[PDB]
Paper text:
Kd2 values for the most common oncogenic RAS variants were all within threefold of those for wild-type proteins. Similar potency was also observed for inhibition of KRAS(G12V)–RALGDS (RAS-interacting domain (RID)) binding in vitro. Similar potencies were observed for inhibition of RALGDS, PI3Kα and SOS1 binding to KRAS(G12C), KRAS(G12V) or KRAS(G12D), as well as SOS1 binding to wild-type KRAS. We then assessed the pharmacodynamic and anti-tumour activity of RMC-7977 in vivo in the NCI-H441 CDX model of NSCLC (KRASG12V, NSCLC). The relationship between the total tumour concentration of RMC-7977 and inhibition of the RAS pathway transcriptional target DUSP6 in tumour lysates yielded an EC50 of 130 nM, consistent with the measured KRAS(G12V) Kd2 of 85 nM, and with the model for tri-complex RAS inhibition discussed above. In KRASG12V and KRASG12C cells, inhibition of additional markers, including phosphorylation of RAF, ERK and the ERK substrate RSK, was demonstrated. In these cells, there was evidence of durable pathway suppression and apoptosis induction after 48 h of treatment, indicated by sustained pERK, pCRAF and pRSK suppression and moderately increased PARP cleavage.
Numbering used by the authors:
A (entry chain A): 0 to 167
B (entry chain D): 3 to 165
Write the structure that this text describes.
Amino acid sequence: SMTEYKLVVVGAVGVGKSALTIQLIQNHFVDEYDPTIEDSYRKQVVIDGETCLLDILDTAGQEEYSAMRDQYMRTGEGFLCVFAINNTKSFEDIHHYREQIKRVKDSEDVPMVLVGNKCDLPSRTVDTKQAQDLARSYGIPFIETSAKTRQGVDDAFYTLVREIRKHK
Amino acid sequence: NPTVFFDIAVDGEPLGRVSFELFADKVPKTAENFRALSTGEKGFGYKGSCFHRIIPGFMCQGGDFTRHNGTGGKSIYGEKFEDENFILKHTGPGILSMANAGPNTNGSQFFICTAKTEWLDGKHVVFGKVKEGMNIVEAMERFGSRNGKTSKKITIADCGQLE
Ligand SMILES: CCn1c(-c2cc(N3CCN(C4CC4)CC3)cnc2[C@H](C)OC)c2c3cc(ccc31)-c1csc(n1)C[C@H](NC(=O)[C@H]1[C@@H]3COC[C@@H]31)C(=O)N1CCC[C@H](N1)C(=O)OCC(C)(C)C2
Ligand SMILES: Nc1nc2c(ncn2[C@@H]2O[C@H](COP(=O)(O)OP(=O)(O)NP(=O)(O)O)[C@@H](O)[C@H]2O)c(=O)[nH]1
Ligand SMILES: [Mg+2]
């Protein structure tokens, strides 16, 4: 059967992890705020001509439960690290997520994509140049997205699969 | 302190009555919101709404009577109101406390503890406790799940204030 890829979506509260995932899976924009406990989704897609199955874990941004992330980081094969371009604090939180994944995986070479979400909004506080420079220092792709307009949604998840394929 | 009740139903079948003491002596604004939403005297409130999130080992959460999807609800003071105080703690089963989406975002959603949840102290306003019918809350746990999705519709079929 087609290869399955275990993807994990992480980032601070309210950056759009669920909105991005529900756009990918259900082609629908969630405008209301429904903070996540834990949700899983499945979707088959074609990436570079090869059909595969995305198994996506949508995680909670709650800082109170940061010590409970280790198990899903052990199981995940690739990570979408999401911040919001109008939320400087969520961008600062990214470093903490990457360090946590690196520590759990004990590796500098973990499939990851940096995602700057909410690019439809006029209230930008994180420059594209800052985020490109951070992704470069990590050695990972950076993609700007909007769960509202669907800009970059497929591309962010597809790029993460391409990163997994290159690593294994 | 005033007492209110919920008559709980499961897929429309009666389950039983839970009663609550509301700590008006320590959290009067928060107790009053819950009391008025339980009588329905503002023309809106808990009657007919569901417990949308039930997580065995932890709590039962409900109170979204405006959107019926876990994101809604409103207080009698406006859509949301401030955290009154954090005097009371989440000390064990039966504690009644306000749900929120961050600081100063109390509406109508609430939760009932089925265990001690001390990590919520200082973040959720405790304002009452179960007085009678804790076994009804315990019975609601078998309709819950790890992430809180329920397997049957758990509703507040009736609610009100007791003498
Ligand atoms: C990490 C997993 N995980 C856990 C958790 C944690 C633990 N521990 C922590 C404590 N450890 C001890 C110190 C050693 C033991 C292991 C074990 N297993 C789990 C669960 C079962 O693993 C799936 C939780 C939990 C809670 C959240 C997100 C993830 C969570 C979360 C998201 S949103 C919120 N919390 C607050 C929420 N806000 C809204 O709903 C807003 C909606 C919009 O605006 C109105 C309305 C709200 O007010 N409440 C009212 C209060 C209880 C609260 N919901 C809720 O559901 O808590 C669930 C739970 C299980 C108690 C905690
Ligand atoms: N304008 C705009 N709003 C967005 C975008 N993505 C998410 N939002 C909004 O931001 C809020 C939070 O989104 P949500 O997906 O629930 O965030 P989350 O990261 O999953 N939060 P949690 O960690 O609590 O589960 C919602 O009101 C949602 O509609 C986007 O690209 N553009
Ligand atoms: Mg979410």
